[PDB]
Design a protein around this ligand. Structure first.
Ligand SMILES: O=C(O)[C@@H]1O[C@@H](O[C@H]2[C@H](O)[C@H](O)[C@H](O[C@H]3[C@H](O)[C@H](O)[C@H](O[C@H]4[C@H](O)[C@H](O)[C@H](O)O[C@H]4C(=O)O)O[C@H]3C(=O)O)O[C@H]2C(=O)O)[C@@H](O)[C@@H](O)[C@@H]1O
Ligand SMILES: O=C(O)[C@@H]1O[C@@H](O[C@H]2[C@H](O)[C@H](O)[C@H](O[C@H]3[C@H](O)[C@H](O)[C@H](O[C@H]4[C@H](O)[C@H](O)[C@H](O)O[C@H]4C(=O)O)O[C@H]3C(=O)O)O[C@H]2C(=O)O)[C@@H](O)[C@@H](O)[C@@H]1O
Lengths: 379, 380
């Protein structure tokens, strides 16, 4: 499989078995095709489909509201907003790109994978429609930046915390590699997309906000690097992947994993079992890329000897029994997120206790969650 | 004496008195409220018709929302039929503009209606009336007098009436419309049209299959149904019906829902049981604001099975002091502030000074812009 943001081992195996005619996978892939049909009929989304404009007055600028920041009732205009960690302000849904980057990202990702597996041009044609409109179109494509992501009304300074929104459309960026070579993805489509990705990469690395986010001390810094690897893997910059893992990702695990394997930065959140998992999910998606060039982030130590497997170890008992979690978790923790996480980390580590638990937790065979497409092995 | 309506008439009367006499504490406070009210004067009137996705009638004047706990089923190709995840609000609810729009309308009109009553400034009635006409009676923008498509569920075959509970967001604004009666802005024609709307909405709620079902409900829906029923009935001046609904419906329903220890078993089986216990009593609290203005005290009047609503406050009072001691399922944190208005209302009604003191101790923020707190200077 081409370098991209997915378990390439599971993807190749599915492509093999579908091409060999194996009945189980063929049944499973045909189910996926029935699910994928809405993405073929779906109209391409754009970040420009919004009424309230960013300070730039450019509808091509991505803007969302930071989810935990609420109008302050004791102020006449409600400004400046105030933070309530863990409580999502429904005002976020007044920004169309919040949900639309998920919908677009889901649409293009599923179509791109099904194209890789089946070789059917109808899926590349659909994926390319979504990729053109979201990214590169001279009127509908988003500008390559995240200046106004997770804005906070009344905040004086500019922050880089919104960059984490980028994960919703950056996985679709990588999956564009899978439709290269289809008749629908022309040389011109690739060059424009390459050019956008290069420009988005520059912004990530050189803007003040991108820089700040690259230094974040919690799961934001990890997710920044996972997004970075998707952009770099798309651009086929393998040495930069190697440098990012050794000079940024591993120091970050080494600093954020404590001697007992907990993640202290996530423990102090109101959703500490969710955010502990969310940090490891950054590592999981980064590792899907690093391991394709021979770097295993689960077992490779940071310079102080810490290994990300220690963090899974710490959480594994609570994945068996979430009610035992002793830190603040003001909403129920969805145990299903542990399945893919424990399967990814289990196989990387040869830890069958982890792999066994992933299958027991399992995923619903017929679910349409697109991130679960590769994991027949769990279904 | 304040017109009959959905508010603590004692507090409102007190505020108007002190404001007119010129007392400083009240005049300063009303001057804060007038500053908060200024956005509602500039605010453009909302209409339920401002939606892209239409209801099965293809009529945009029909109110429609999604039942907040029903999610697409991922294991089905179309997601249908939706499945319930109690307590977890599906963000799809926000694709129905009237969900939040009825809140914005109701706050704006209530605040304007109260401020006109307290201060007598015509600019408040004129703004209130603009919102009332546009939401209720306007022949193009006014909502149809029904709640057929409230909290619909995609793929569900039966028709449900549980969505009727949404009516509380605009029905208090209906009640406050009485306060601007007599202004120059609220003409006889405005009042007649609104009377006709309210009469027709009352007919719908009492005779439609969904209204009948909802009137029979055994949990907080039945209480909220009757609390809403009272606001429409009080708006219409049918005081004999208010007596009958209080006597034959709210109290029997209240008594059947209170257990021997004072707990509310119907709310205890919910994933947000301390929220839903409080939500049940808030229905009675708001209905009592109407019944007690005609001499029926729902906090202290026992039902015929012997249960009395003060028993349910007793069961919940300790957990209002210390919400973390709550032993039943509560999958989101409980807002202790909701206890402030609740305990003062039931406290003053019951002569329970321990309840009134805790209300003031928990309190409300003096400068808050939450419109439901306008009458409660005493808590600020
Ligand atoms: O998009 C979502 O809705 C949501 O995203 C994921 O959670 C994200 C949030 O989007 C949000 O960015 C939040 O950021 C937190 C976080 O703690 C962050 O480090 C920063 O903290 C600030 C803050 O002012 C603190 O008071 C402190 O001083 O630290 C600051 C700092 O600079 O570090 O900002 C806050 C905030 O703005 O509330 O949490 C994010 C995260 O931690 O990943 C996630 O829940 C995802 O599942 C969901 O989809
Ligand atoms: O709009 C909000 O977000 C929210 O509204 C208030 O909560 C309401 C909900 O809007 C919703 O209607 C929910 O209703 C429950 C409830 O349990 C109800 O009685 C009925 O339950 C049915 C259902 O079929 C059950 O599965 C069971 O068999 O019992 C039935 C019964 O009739 O008893 O409908 C369900 C449902 O469909 O989810 O809860 C409401 C409530 O309890 O009042 C409220 O939380 C408010 O603060 C908030 O604004």
């Amino acid at each position: 499989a081409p370098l991209g943001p997915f378990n390439a081992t599971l993807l190749e195996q599915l492509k093999n078995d579908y091409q060999k005619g194996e009945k189980e996978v063929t049944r499973y892939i045909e189910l996926q095709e029935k699910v994928a049909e809405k993405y073929i009929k779906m109209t391409p989304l754009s970040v420009t489909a919004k009424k309230k404009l960013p300070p730039s007055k450019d509808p091509r600028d991505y803007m969302t509201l930071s989810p935990y920041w609420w109008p302050d009732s004791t102020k006449i205009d409600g400004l400046p907003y105030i933070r309530k960690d863990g409580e999502r302000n429904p005002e976020v849904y007044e920004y169309p790109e919040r949900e639309n980057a998920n919908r677009f990202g889901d649409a293009a990702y599923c179509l791109g994978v099904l194209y890789y597996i089946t070789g059917k041009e109808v899926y590349a044609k659909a994926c390319a429609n979504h990729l053109r409109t979201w990214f590169t179109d001279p009127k509908l494509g988003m500008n390559p930046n995240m200046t106004y992501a997770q804005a906070v009304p009344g905040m004086k300074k500019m922050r880089g915390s919104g960059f984490i929104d980028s994960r919703r459309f950056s996985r679709a960026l990588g999956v564009a590699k899978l439709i290269e070579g289809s008749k629908s993805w022309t040389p011109s489509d690739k060059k424009k997309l390459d050019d956008w990705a290069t420009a988005f990469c520059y912004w990530m690395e050189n803007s003040t906000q991108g820089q700040r986010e690259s230094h974040a001390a919690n799961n934001h810094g990890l997710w920044y690097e996972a997004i970075h690897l998707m952009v770099l893997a798309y651009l086929d910059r393998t040495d930069r992947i190697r440098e990012v893992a050794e000079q940024s990702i591993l120091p970050k695990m080494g600093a954020q994993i404590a001697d007992d394997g907990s993640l202290p930065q996530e423990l102090k959140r109101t959703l500490s079992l969710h955010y502990s998992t969310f940090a490891l999910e950054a590592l999981m998606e980064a590792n899907q890329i690093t391991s394709q060039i021979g770097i295993n982030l689960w077992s490779t130590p940071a310079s102080n000897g810490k290994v990300a497997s220690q963090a899974v170890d710490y959480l594994y008992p609570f994945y068996l029994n979430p009610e035992d979690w002793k830190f603040k978790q003001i909403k129920p923790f969805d145990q299903s997120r542990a399945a893919i996480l424990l399967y990814e980390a289990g196989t990387a580590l040869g830890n069958q206790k982890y792999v066994d638990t992933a299958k027991r937790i399992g995923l619903k065979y017929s679910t349409s969650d697109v991130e679960t497409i590769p994991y027949l092995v769990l279904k």
